[PDB]
Paper text:
Mixed lineage leukemia (MLL) family enzymes, including MLL1-4/KMT2A-2D, SET1A/KMT2F, and SET1B/KMT2G, are the major histone lysine 4 (K4) methyltransferases in mammals. The MLL family enzymes share an evolutionarily conserved catalytic Su(Var), Enhancer of Zeste, Trithorax (SET) domain14 as well as four highly conserved SET-interacting proteins, i.e., RbBP5 (retinoblastoma-binding protein 5), ASH2L (Absent, small, homeotic disks-2-like), WDR5 (WD40 repeat-containing protein 5), and DPY30 (DumPY protein 30). Here we report the single-particle cryo-EM structure of the human MLL1 core complex bound to the NCP. Importantly, we show that the MLL1 core complex docks on the NCP through concurrent interactions of ASH2L/RbBP5 with nucleosomal DNA and histone H4.
A recombinant human MLL1 core complex (MLL1RWSAD) containing RbBP5 (residues 1–538), WDR5 (residues 25–330), MLL1SET (residues 3762–3969), ASH2L (residues 1–534), and DPY30 (residues 1–99) was reconstituted in vitro. The cryo-EM structure of MLL1RWSAD-NCP was determined at a resolution of 6.2 Å. The overall architecture of the MLL1RWSAD-NCP complex revealed that MLL1RWSAD anchors at the edge of the NCP through two core components, RbBP5 and ASH2L. Within the NCP, we observed that DNA superhelical location 7 (SHL7) and SHL1.5, together with H4 N-terminal tail, were involved in the interaction with MLL1RWSAD. Distinct from many of the previously reported NCP-recognizing proteins or protein complexes, the MLL1 core complex did not interact with the acidic-patch region of the NCP. The MLL1RWSAD-NCP model revealed that ASH2L IDRs interacted with the SHL7 of nucleosomal DNA. Our MLL1RWSAD-NCP model pinpointed a short stretch of positively charged residues (i.e., K205/R206/K207) in the ASH2L Linker-IDR with potential to make contacts with nucleosomal DNA. Given the binding of RbBP5 and ASH2L at the edge of the NCP (SHL1.5 and SHL7), the catalytic MLL1SET domain was positioned at the nucleosome dyad with the active site of the MLL1SET domain pointing outward. The distance between Lys37 on each H3 tail and the active site of MLL1SET was ~60 Å, allowing active-site access to H3 K4 and K9, but not to H3K27. More importantly, the active site near nucleosome dyad had almost equal accessibility to K4 residues on both H3 tails.
Residue numbers in the entry:
A (entry chain K), B (entry chain G): 37 to 134
C (entry chain M), D (entry chain I): 12 to 118
E (entry chain N), F (entry chain J): 29 to 121
G (entry chain H), H (entry chain L): 20 to 101
The structure:
Amino acid sequence: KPHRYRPGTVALREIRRYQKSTELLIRKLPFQRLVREIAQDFKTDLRFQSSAVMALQEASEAYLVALFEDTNLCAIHAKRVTIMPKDIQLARRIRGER
Amino acid sequence: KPHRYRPGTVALREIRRYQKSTELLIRKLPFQRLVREIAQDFKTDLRFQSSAVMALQEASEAYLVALFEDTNLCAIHAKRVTIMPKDIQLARRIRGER
Amino acid sequence: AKAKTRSSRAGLQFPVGRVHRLLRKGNYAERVGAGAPVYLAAVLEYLTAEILELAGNAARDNKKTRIIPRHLQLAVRNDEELNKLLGRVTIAQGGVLPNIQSVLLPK
Amino acid sequence: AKAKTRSSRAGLQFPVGRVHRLLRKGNYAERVGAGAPVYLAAVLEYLTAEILELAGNAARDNKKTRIIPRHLQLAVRNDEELNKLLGRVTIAQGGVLPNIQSVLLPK
Amino acid sequence: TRKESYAIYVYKVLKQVHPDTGISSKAMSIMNSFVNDVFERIAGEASRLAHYNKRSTITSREIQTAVRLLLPGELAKHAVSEGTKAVTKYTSA
Amino acid sequence: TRKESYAIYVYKVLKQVHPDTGISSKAMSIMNSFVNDVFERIAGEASRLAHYNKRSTITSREIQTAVRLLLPGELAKHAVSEGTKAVTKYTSA
Amino acid sequence: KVLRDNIQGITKPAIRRLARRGGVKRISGLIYEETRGVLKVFLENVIRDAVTYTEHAKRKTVTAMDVVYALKRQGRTLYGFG
Amino acid sequence: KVLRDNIQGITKPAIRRLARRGGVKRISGLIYEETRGVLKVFLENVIRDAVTYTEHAKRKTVTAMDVVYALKRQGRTLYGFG
DNA sequence: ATCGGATGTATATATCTGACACGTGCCTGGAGACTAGGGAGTAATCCCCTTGGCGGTTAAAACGCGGGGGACAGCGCGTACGTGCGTTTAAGCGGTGCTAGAGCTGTCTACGACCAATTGAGCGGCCTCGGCACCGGGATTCTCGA
């Protein structure tokens, strides 16, 4: 008979190993293309350092995991294990991002 | 027969008039005594400007109503009209105050 | 040789001399550009115009000639970009702009 | 003409002369206190010592001779005082310290 | 003690925008403190960028760039245009 | 083009604390950037204070005061001690 | 003249007044003292830092500009006091 | 070479990977695009400000020190890039 | 509540290496020595804000007091979400090749720096008076029982 772990369990171990790991979790090229797309909005044909864009993606992902973290916390205060967009919105609200 | 307004209603009007009013809502002398008590902890027998302590109390109360405000908001996300200490704690948490 | 203020030649109201004085006394650069105080003072005059105009709007809305800090706080929390500029700033005698939450309403 | 650097005169490592030149070129004050570079560099020496020490603690806690930025993140997140010092600061290749909330565990 | 402020120019530009209006001296002091705040902000940012540019000369280009860094959207745009017009006027003579 | 750093000094203090433990260049430059940031922190703060004192000179008392402003509690205490030590060791020169 | 326990000098009516200003309807008791603590903690910093200024100011009285520069350094700047 | 729609280039698996790193168990769909938006909005500032630096830098390529000073000015400073 | 099986994870091992510790020759910032000014430090003076107390008031706080209102606990269901397995897909290595643009040096020059001579824009100080704050009273409108 096929076995399937209970829900979250696999995701739980994923959480554990991700707090274990430290490297990026975003594919480089898509992020870079997104950055250049954003750039051409303000000015077209602008070049970048690989170090620069690595910094962009690292700092972003840091802000992003922080947002995910405190939104997780808020959802704890929301007594749910599922996340709700309003949690993120109000988190930014408390983060003065509104 | 004696009349009593339904709950909150009087407090609701209080909210309305307080958003209407702008002056302080803390008695001056108690706040000042508290400030001097706090001061003697770091150094005893220190004098103050009335302007200085007025600034202290105004800025405090501002921070305090901001905390009450976003904790109200969080409690909205908590789907309650009653406030809970955990709301304040986690608000400070999002406010980076932990 | 009659001495006219440089702000006159700039056609502005804030004293660019005092500006450049604070600049040199501010320890920002070894030597300040000529038109830099002019430019920044112009920016300052413009933003002051904006804020004072908003304040006058609020005060006249409240049927008030003398403009109290409450009007200014209200205008501050009424301009989104200005608020963004000043949301990190606290305001004496500001109070709170009237904000009512939905679930707060009775039925 | 015997030479002796101010760092040796303080028996420390951080370059008092270099940091003095730096603050001079930093345009903060007209004159300077000659001992202020010594003092500040000593403070830097101290704080750097603590942070690198905690970093090495994590490193050999992980059998790691050469310290990795993850060690740095863990160190700066463990100590309350240093974390408070660098709360809104971010670290390259930092990651997140281990943290699982109570209700996250299944019962 | 000779203390310097700007409330006179506040009254001036007020009449320039609202001639029939009064102010609380409290509010004037608040506005002046705000003036000082924005001034120190822009000055520090300009000095910092010039340091990044290793420049010892803070000029109007620095001014405009730092305002753009600070002010958002149309606020920044209008401010840039105004400073530009004013420096043009001053340079015209 | 000569680019100054403190990798020498950070490695020195590393050995002084951990002769055994190594170091990565990434974390090295991290340390360097960090110390630059905190040095600019203290520099700006002390300059701001002295400007409040309107004192064109920047001395060690300013440094002590401003680091006390900067550091969370006991660190500063510890900190200032060694700092004092330093200047004492340097005043005793 | 050694002071004490002015923290409870903060009246619960005052706290609820501030809350109503913040637009709050229903409140629990557990908040107030908790609130107070925070209050203390909050001011816990500034005064010290303020007198720290006064520390370097070499003066016995404490001024507004102290807390001005504190809130500035605390990123909570205020206007209307020079 | 006009770019577009790389925002959806952010994979939902990537988003949930970041969430798991943040220690999240159950997630809804409505988040991701919302998330993306925020992401955009977030970076919406920095690059501009960054190139603003590059603006004053009078250069065509954009450097790390740009975003360094941005995050600094954005109060989100980062280490390890000079 | 246990045991068995599945699975996922911590370990030892081997070697590869490329960062990395290490050492160089060469450069210039740092040290060393000398001169000036003048910011800073000290002191006597004035002021004058503060800190202290005293008495009367009441609005405000304390406290009590129902009591409806919601916090909360539980309970049904269902839809949305983990999961494991499919599928296909761009991501990454890597290596190539061009140069646009950073990034460096060498001018030369306009440009504040700075000082000196001049002063009127501005600021402390002094009337002054009118929106404004307070008050009392009348009329309006929400609200809670029909």
